[PDB]
Design a protein around this ligand. Structure first.
Ligand SMILES: O=C[C@H](O)[C@@H](O)[C@H](O[C@H]1O[C@H](CO)[C@@H](O[C@H]2O[C@H](CO)[C@@H](O)[C@H](O)[C@H]2O)[C@H](O)[C@H]1O)[C@H](O)CO
Length: 370
């Protein structure tokens, strides 16, 4: 319940939290504030729980998509970036953390899923989704696999679902229409259908999750996987000669990944607000600060223009920018949690066989717009 001296930070496990701790030091030994960093479980679901009682971390990291609900629940502080600072970050990243005009977080990095392939097995990576089933038929005969990604989190299948048409919330004259949802239109159904078909034709397993797929690929068992910049660290460690490129098209439409902006929001019940502003504005959001977290686990494209300039040389980041470009930037409205819940079940249910695509996506549309 508060700290009055020190900064407690919270950031997901697949993020470079040990590097964040690095930055905490250069900030402590420079000012004298002891910065503790944590990677609790389901922090996105727990931060609001604790922050309600007036506890939790001083700073919480998470993709902007959850920040509108937090802001609504009154758990976040309005940040004070002057006209000068904001100039350092891309204007569209500031739009990501803007809840009703107000700014409720500092954009850290822009994330987008990309197609990671095994250069030795697949020197010529598939360009259409449609050519994957025949590709797996050939590979299955070599003991190998064509593709494997986490089906347990909708974020991973959304690119295919959005490709020929699906969408979360329609953007109208200035706002997102919470009643106009596209989880059950013709394109949403086609996309998921194609995925259900892959499974039914045994070119994929409906149980695959993050662990399983990171293993299949890093061990050299599957020719491809779909993951984020944060996944490159464990791959470099395996040494697998991989490539990061544009996701496959579907029905000729590029895959459309939901774009996330890693962000640092200040707890509303924190007494160290000025510290958080200082830590984030002058230490983290520097070239050195971000570079300290990127060395641990890649952030992907960063909000900081000065550091992104040094990062866009990397083809993995070039590929990240191209997929983000072809995808839509996520909404931050409180409804995004209802959306993700509903769509998670639909995809999970549809994949196992518990519901038909039609039944799944229909139930989601109903739950979401209820
Ligand atoms: O801010 C960073 C995230 O917390 C990140 O460290 C985690 O990993 C990534 O993968 C997530 C999905 O596994 C993305 O979550 C997004 O989608 C899910 C539904 O699939 C939704 O619940 C989240 O609100 C939404 O952000 C992350 O954006 C991405 O960074 C994340 O903690 C893992 O759940």
């Amino acid at each position: 319940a508060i700290e009055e001296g020190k900064l407690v930070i919270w950031i997901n496990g697949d993020k470079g939290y040990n590097g964040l701790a690095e930055v905490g030091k250069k900030f402590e030994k420079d000012t004298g504030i002891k910065v503790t960093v944590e990677h609790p479980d389901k922090l996105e679901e727990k931060f609001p729980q604790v922050a309600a009682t007036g506890d939790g971390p001083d700073i919480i990291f998470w993709a902007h998509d959850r920040f509108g609900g937090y802001a609504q629940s009154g758990l976040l502080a309005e940040i004070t970036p002057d006209k000068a600072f904001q100039d350092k970050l891309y204007p569209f990243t500031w739009d990501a953390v803007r809840y009703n005009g107000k700014l409720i977080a500092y954009p850290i990095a822009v994330e987008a899923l990309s197609l990671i392939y095994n250069k030795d097995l697949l020197p010529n990576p598939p360009k259409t989704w449609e050519e994957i089933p025949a590709l797996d038929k050939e590979l299955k005969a070599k003991g190998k696999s064509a593709l494997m990604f986490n089906l347990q989190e909708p974020y991973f299948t959304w690119p295919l679902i959005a490709a020929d048409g699906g969408y979360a919330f329609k953007y109208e004259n200035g706002k997102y229409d919470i009643k106009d949802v596209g989880v059950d239109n013709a394109g949403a159904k086609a996309g998921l259908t194609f995925l259900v078909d892959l499974i039914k034709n045994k070119h994929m397993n409906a149980d695959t999750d993050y662990s399983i797929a990171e293993a299949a690929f890093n061990k050299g068992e599957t020719a491809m996987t779909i993951n984020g910049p944060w996944a490159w660290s464990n791959i470099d460690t395996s040494k697998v000669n991989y490539g990061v490129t544009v996701l496959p098209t579907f029905k000729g439409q590029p895959s459309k990944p939901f774009v996330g902006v890693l962000s640092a929001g200040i707890n509303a019940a924190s007494p160290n607000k000025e510290l958080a502003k200082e830590f984030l504005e002058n230490y983290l959001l520097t070239d050195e600060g971000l570079e300290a977290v990127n060395k641990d686990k890649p952030l992907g494209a960063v909000a900081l223009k000065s550091y992104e300039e040094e990062l866009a040389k990397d083809p993995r980041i070039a590929a990240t920018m191209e997929n983000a470009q072809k995808g839509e930037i996520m909404p931050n409205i409180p409804q995004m949690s209802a959306f993700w819940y509903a769509v998670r079940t639909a995809v999970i249910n549809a994949a196992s066989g518990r519901q038909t695509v039609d039944e799944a996506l229909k139930d989601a549309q109903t739950r979401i717009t209820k």
